[PDB]
Amino acid sequence: PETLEARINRATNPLNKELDWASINGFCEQLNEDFEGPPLATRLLAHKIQSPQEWEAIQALTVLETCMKSCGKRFHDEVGKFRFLNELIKVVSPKYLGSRTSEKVKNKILELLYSWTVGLPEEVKIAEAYQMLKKQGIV
């Protein structure tokens, strides 16, 4: 019920008629209290973000965007690692899942990556990845 998997399953539920902030916020807060919380979150998020069901991926991206705003280095570092960024690159790059992914889900990933390269220049890997997608003509 309070486990990350149960929270993410509610926050990114394909059935939700509208964003569920309670569950999304609860999810961000729940990860900020565990040394293993962040790694498990990014892993669970990469999966949801890659779902063929657009409303599932959009809500997962909404969760990623939200937790990045209210979290420390613990989660900011997990997203900064290529271990996570690659899963996003996979979703927007046609060379992988890019061709079958909704333009909406792709654009949102690109807004986030940019938003982070600006508000978090520290995370070089995020910028480094964002740059590659830009030179690659994907942006």
Binding site: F82, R83, N86, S93, Y96, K125, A129
Partner: peptide, 7 residues
């Protein structure tokens, strides 16, 4: 503790 950027 991390992987290489997707080529």
């Amino acid at each position: 503790d991390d992987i290489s950027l997707l080529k």
